[PDB]
Amino acid sequence: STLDKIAKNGVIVVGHRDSSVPFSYYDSQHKVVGYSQEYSNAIVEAVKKKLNKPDLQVKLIPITSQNRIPLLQNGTYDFECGSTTNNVERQKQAAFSDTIFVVGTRLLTKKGGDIKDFANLKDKAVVVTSGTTSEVLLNKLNEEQKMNMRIISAKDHGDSFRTLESGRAVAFMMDDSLLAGERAKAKKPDDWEIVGKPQSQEAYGCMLRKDDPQFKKLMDDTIAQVQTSGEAEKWFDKWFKNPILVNHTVYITADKQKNGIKANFKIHHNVEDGSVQLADHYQQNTPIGDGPVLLPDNHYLSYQSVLSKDPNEKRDHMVLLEFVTATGNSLGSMSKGEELFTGVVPILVELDGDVNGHKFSVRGEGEGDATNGKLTLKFICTTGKLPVPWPTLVTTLVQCFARYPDHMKQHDFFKSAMPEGYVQERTISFKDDGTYKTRAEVKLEGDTLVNRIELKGIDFKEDGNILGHKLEYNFNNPLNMNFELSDEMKALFKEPNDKAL
Ligand SMILES: N[C@@H](CCC(=O)O)C(=O)O
Numbered sequence: 001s002t003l004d005k006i007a008k009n010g011v012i013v014v015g016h017r018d019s020s021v022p023f024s025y026y027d028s029q030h031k032v033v034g035y036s037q038e039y040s041n042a043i044v045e046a047v048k049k050k051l052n053k054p055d056l057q058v059k060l061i062p063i064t065s066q067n068r069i070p071l072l073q074n075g076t077y078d079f080e081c082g083s084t085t086n087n088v089e090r091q092k093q094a095a096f097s098d099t100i101f102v103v104g105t106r107l108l109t110k111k112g113g114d115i116k117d118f119a120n121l122k123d124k125a126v127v128v129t130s131g132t133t134s135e136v137l138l139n140k141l142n143e144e145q146k147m148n149m150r151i152i153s154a155k156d157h158g159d160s161f162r163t164l165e166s167g168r169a170v171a172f173m174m175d176d177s178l179l180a181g182e183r184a185k186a187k188k189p190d191d192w193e194i195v196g197k198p199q200s201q202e203a204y205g206c207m208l209r210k211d212d213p214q215f216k217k218l219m220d221d222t223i224a225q226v227q228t229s230g231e232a233e234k235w236f237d238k239w240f241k242n243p244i245l246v247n248h249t250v251y252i253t254a255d256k257q258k259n260g261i262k263a264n265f266k267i268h269h270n271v272e273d274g275s276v277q278l279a280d281h282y283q284q285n286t287p288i289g290d291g292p293v294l295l296p297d298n299h300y301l302s303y304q305s306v307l308s309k310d311p312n313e314k315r316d317h318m319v320l321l322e323f324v325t326a327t328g329n330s331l332g333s334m335s336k337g338e339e340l341f342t343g344v345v346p347i348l349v350e351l352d353g354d355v356n357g358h359k360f361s362v363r364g365e366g367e368g369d370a371t372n373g374k375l376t377l378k379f380i381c382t383t384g385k386l387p388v389p390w391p392t393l394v395t396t397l398v399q400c401f402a403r404y405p406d407h408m409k410q411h412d413f414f415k416s417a418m419p420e421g422y423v424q425e426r427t428i429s430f431k432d433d434g435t436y437k438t439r440a441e442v443k444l445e446g447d448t449l450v451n452r453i454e455l456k457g458i459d460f461k462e463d464g465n466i467l468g469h470k471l472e473y474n475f476n477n478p479l480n481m482n483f484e485l486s487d488e489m490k491a492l493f494k495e496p497n498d499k500a501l
Contacts, residue, residue: 001212006056007053011059012078013076014061014077015076015079015080016037017062019157019182020083021181023035023181024082027245027329029329032060033331037331038332039222039226040080041331042223043079043219061076061077064155068084069207072209078209078215079206079207079219081100083103083175085203094209095207095208095209096207097219097220098497099205099497100223101177103177103202104175104198104201105175106173106175106179106197106198107172107179107196108164108172108179109170111191111192117197118196118197121149122149124170125170126150126151127154127164128152128154129159132174135151138151157178160174161185171195179194180481184246184479203500203501206223220496224496228496233485243477248267248303250300251263251264258284264282266280269389269391269472270474271472273470277430279428279430280427280428281395282427282429284426285417287420287421294412300326302324302325303324307391318393318397320366320377323374323403324403326411328408334412337415341418345370345447345449346365346367347364347366347398347448347449347451348365348449348451349362349364350450350451350453351363352453352454353457354457355455356434356457361383363382364377366378371403373403389465391472392471396440400415420443421441422443423441425437425438432464433466436457438453439454
């Protein structure tokens with residue numbers, strides 16, 4: 001029995017997925033998260049209570065759609081909660097818990113094309129993940145409907161999507177939620193649409209070994225309680241209505257050696273030829289004054305940025321709208337400076353730059369509303385034509401305006417350093433191109449929040465993406481699933497069941 005194996009070994013081994021978004025997947029920090037993974041954590045805690053082993057160790061191992069049943073049967077892991085369909089054929093090989101979600105198998109395809117339904121796949125190349133129910137359905141469409149599809153089978157859902165994205169398939173067949181999760185990780189999410197009448201409705205269950213009724217009972221009792229108590233719907237909201245923190249994230253950590261914070265993150269700039277220019281950011285902040293500051297636990301700043309133009313503006317310029325929210329990404333006033341940001345605060349930004357000897361200045365003004373995390377700024381190049389693309393300066397051109405929720409205000413270093421302020425320094429390394437070094441002082445001067453920056457760029461290619469002005473005027477934002485919980489799911493959460501559909 002699995003509970004006997006766990007008790008004897010002092011460990012419970014939890015299988016998990018790499019990229020089943022938003023069910024079980026790695027976030028930007030290589031931590032396993034998602035709606036289904038919440039159940040894994042709850043089941044792990046229920047096992048600790050059942051066995052009265054509060055120090056039980058937890059081992060996470062990655063599985064695929066293809067290897068999940070062999071690795072379960074040979075004891076490599078003990079259970080998994082992810083995106084595995086409960087059906088009668090698989091019940092010959094494994095057991096399933098109460099259902100945790102229901103999906104429909106559809107198609108992801110590029111907009112502007114001719115794939116509107118499954119009938120349009122005739123004679124075409126279609127990608128699917130090896131070892132899935134969709135792979136079976138595609139082969140059945142070939143055998144029974146003479147569709148003559150060339151079926152490309154990829155190792156995991158991210159590999160499947162990237163096959164579609166690169167043009168090597170006309171469509172990706174998969175569970176519709178998983179398709180939306182892969183689209184959210186795309187270079188250009190808005191290029192992709194989910195189409196087609198669903199070929200099946202499928203229930204996700206947590207998978208465990210068969211003929212182990214006592215472990216299945218613990219699992220079902222735990223799931224049914226989470227569902228009937230409302231916690232499952234809270235998990236749905238958490239993982240289906242909040243930014244997916246995989247791409248375009250900002251992860252803040254404490255830099256205690258310097259009484260401040262640091263961050264290491266990646267900005268992806270779209271190139272006008274369809275490629276992506278990586279801008280690797282390393283950031284360090286340290287207080288200007290000697291007063292006490294707040295040193296945070298690890299957390300994210302989730303940025304939503306919109307770049308626009310002012311129609312009545314003849315100078316080279318950028319209008320920037322941003323919403324910035326601090327968040328954790330976990331399963332399952334605090335400074336005097338905080339008080340200085342309860343209203344709307346005028347902002348002044350001054351940047352003096354030199355990229356490959358090309359000297360330029362930027363002046364910005366606007367306001368910050370940290371209660372809502374909202375920034376409105378307009379920047380002008382006061383020296384003429386800006387010699388680099390505006391999107392490359394967005395991150396350089398006031399994290400004190402992030403919205404820290406009530407339960408996280410003890411982690412707001414940026415406001416705690418105010419009014420005396422902080423130094424913000426970055427290296428921005430453009431892949432296959434030059435590097436920005438930036439140094440800013442951010443401080444309250446009277447009632448104005450001032451961001452004064454020096455920027456030094458070196459080693460840029462004069463015909464490259466930056467000095468050659470080949471970057472699109474836009475910005476990548478972390479997306480959310482933007483799904484609502486269906487009536488069918490709410491009825492299931494009221495009356496949990498483990499039935500294949
Ligand atoms: N739910 C389907 C596809 C998703 C997956 O395998 O991760 C299956 O179990 O085959």
